[model samples]
Target: TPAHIAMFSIAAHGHVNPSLEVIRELVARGHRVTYAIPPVFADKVAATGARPVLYHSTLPGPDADPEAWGSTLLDNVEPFLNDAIQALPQLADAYADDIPDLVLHDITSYPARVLARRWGVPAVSLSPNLVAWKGYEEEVAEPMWREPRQTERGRAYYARFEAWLKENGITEHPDTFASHPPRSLVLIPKALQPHADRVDEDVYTFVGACQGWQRPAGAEKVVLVSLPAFYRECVRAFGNLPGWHLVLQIPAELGELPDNVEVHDWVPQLAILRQADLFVTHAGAGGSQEGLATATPMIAVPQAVDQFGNADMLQGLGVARKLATEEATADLLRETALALVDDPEVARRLRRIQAEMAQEGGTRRAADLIEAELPA
Candidate 1:
């Protein structure tokens, strides 16, 4: 029988983009897919040949400020649980009579898990970023939540989440959701994984990036920059970094360019990175993985969110260095850029990661695994 798959994904860029190709590949393989998403990404999901099932959400859009969510990690996480609790019934009703054979869900789509449990079907979590390893609870989650868990509001949040799960037939605690799952596919390169040694082999599989990369057009000692806040600093700094031709990618116009620097609204990034001497990035998952795939050393200057942690990880890998905004002077950028540009060991590690990345079967393997899990 043909698989009737249902996917629930959030509309955010990181969550949606990583799974597009996998969805597309599944569609090409003749599976019937029904994707539940917000209206903003309805057309994008439809573009993958999956039927777009629309729902509205109160979650922040791309332009929304993180400050509005208040401080603390649970402060940020509580909103999603609230959203799931409110949105689950609408989705549950929609699929009540027409439930698919399996549920494919984004990591943030907690309600999907609830619905899967309610319907008695297998659910697979699609992770767009780093997932948990064995000691993640004691090592990461517990320490992070120790202070927060003591508070009345914090204790209440977990209580509400557990009650909601109990109402829907799920037994796993809210804390266990991150590390335990029926199955999960991590859509990042294995090279970026920190705790690969301890990650459970059966539960999570590293599928690598679903998108295919392109070949290098030509060689140039290119310096590509993608961060918006640091554009002026970068242009001014590029003036001092000698001997490399700069192909700086920027969002808007710049005042002047050094003889070596050329500006573009955008460039074919993977293509350019293959020919680049160095990359100065916002350390986004996109930039971080691409630079790693191309074997280019990076100077990661994170602006916000996961980039800060990603920056530290890259530096620890010895393939990149982090430059904070407070001290990003022309001389400092110049010095730091030159220092990381030619580390033989850095190049060695990137090549090793790139080769390891290839062992991941990209879209095909992800499709095969998803198909294998479908009802017989």
Candidate 2:
């Protein structure tokens, strides 16, 4: 029997984009998927042959100010809790009667957890970034939580979350929400994780990367620089490299560009990654995985936050050279790209990681695990 699966995710590019190929893969394998998403994503989701179940989210829409998504870590943490509180009841009500056999949700989508618990269905946590390994509390959370700004945000965020849960007759500490559920699937490459040793084996299963279908080839001469917003200037510097056609993906509002550098509102990222010999990226988890998957070396310019950690990891693996975003000169970009791609050690390490990822059996394996929980 074909099992129906319901998926919940936010509207952001980083969060939504990673799952698109996985969702399409499931549909191709004959699973019926109903994706709960904002109306803006309906056409995109429906294009995969999956039904789109429109839902309202308290989080600001795609066109809303980027700042509304939160700039700092604390800023992001609070909005997720706040939005989850507001969206939970609405999501629960909408799917109460027609709930799928299993729920697959992004780590940030708290409503999915709540709905799964309410309906007594199995749920999987699909992580777009790194997973929480054993010492994450000590290495990442504890240090960040002790910082005054982050501490204040955490306190206020949880206080509001507790109040919201109380009003809904749910009694659980807000801290519990951050903990992993008993049964959840981690949808990222384990190699990208900072502390893979401490992650609980039973609670979270690392199912490697769920890359989308193969992308068509692009212009052979064009090298796409697809780092996040913080590294726009770094990308521009790389554009000046001789004999390289630079296709940079920057915000549409940040208008004006160098003649040699073509600016795109959005680029076919995987397509570009597949063809480019070298990628200059922020070493974001998704980008790192994609770079490794494509066997493309990278000039890793980590501008902020977890990207710093990921940058180090990529460099350690020898498939990338790290550069500070502020210091990424055109000469630096060209040299690093050349060194990263041509180094024998870098090629060897990338091949090993790619082999490991292949053995991990990506999205189809993920779907198999989910289907195992369904009634026979």
Candidate 3:
């Protein structure tokens, strides 16, 4: 049955892209889907046939300098709390007259949960990346954040989050509120999830990649270099390779182009990946899945945050080689790139993962699961 469904997300591309095809599918099925997002992504939401409910956000813009995110765990976390605290009132006002039957949201959109609770609606997380696995807290998150969490700034951050939730009558800790979702549809391949077997099957379902983002080419061996942290290193790595042509997504200040290289601010990434033999990526959630989806070999040079884990996951899957950004010199980059493309076993593993992703049902299945959640 057709019902009103509300989707909530932040402005970032990675968060928004994973669920778009699912939104488009729901709209096509005659469900009225409303997407609440910042003004920056309003048009992209509209294009999916979902109504865009715009709100102001305090978080940095998607294209803001990478450094603007700051360097600590506290630095990384405080903004989301601040944004959610501010965004909730704006979103609440916007939806006050039109509460939906259900709420679907990106993992980062805390207000979605609050608004859903206010309306007594079921809220499902549309996770673009990894969800917490069993023992995730003790095994990973707690240890990593413990030191920073003990600091005065961290204590203050949690206090603010707790107070905000209390104002809404929620009784959970900030960590519990942020990390635990009632139900989630994880959009990445399950193979990409850390400790997949230990993940709670009741709360999270891996529906693979929904994948309706922008589109991606060529040579004896084609290498697509998409990592921002290593553009100069990429050029240095692939500039002189005789049989390979390099496509650098961003035009960093490389004065003269090598014979085998080209630079563009944007390229149809999936399109190019389809034909390319190799991908040099930051192992971001989106990029990792794309490389796997395309059955392309990768040299994973993780830049920050979850990327390090993602890089290891890719390497563990046997289709990519992981390299840290600081250690990604021109020589090492060149060697890894050449080795990845030439390895027959790596190609074999990629094809295997690609076929597994296909069975996870992608966009159509995602919509079906969401529709199942709609109140009858």
Identify the leading candidate in terms of lDDT: 3
TM-score computed on alpha carbons, candidate 3:
0.91
lDDT for each residue of candidate 2 in 194-284, tens digit (9 for 90 to 100): 6777788787777775356132243234456775444455455555555556667666544465555676667877777777777878788
User: Could you estimate the TM-score for every candidate?
Assistant: 0.92, 0.83, 0.91
Candidate ranking (TM-score, best to worst): 1, 3, 2
Check candidate 3 and list the clashing pairs. 215-268, 215-269, 216-268, 216-269, 216-270, 216-271, 216-272, 217-272
Residues 1-376 of candidate 3 have per-residue lDDT tens digits of: 4689999999888789888899999999999999998899999999999999999989888899878877877888888888898899999999999889999999989999999988999999988888899899899889988897888887888888899999998998878889989799999999899899999999998998525622222358888988544788788888868878888888446867798888888888888898788999989887888899999999988878588889888899898898877879899988888788889999999889988888888888888888888876
Could you tell me the TM-score of candidate 2?
A: 0.83
Model 2, residue 77: distance off in Å is: 1.8
Give Cα distance to truth, residue 60, candidate 2, Å. Answer: 2.3
Q: Which parts of model 2 have CA positions greater than 4 angstroms off?
A: 63-65, 147-156, 166-172, 213-223, 228-266
Better model by lDDT: candidate 1 vs candidate 3: 3
How many clashes in each candidate?
0, 2, 8
Clashing pairs in 1: none
Please list all clashing residue pairs in model 2, or write none if there are none.
Answer: 134-198, 134-199
Residue 79 of candidate 2: its Cα lDDT?
78
Best by TM-score: 1
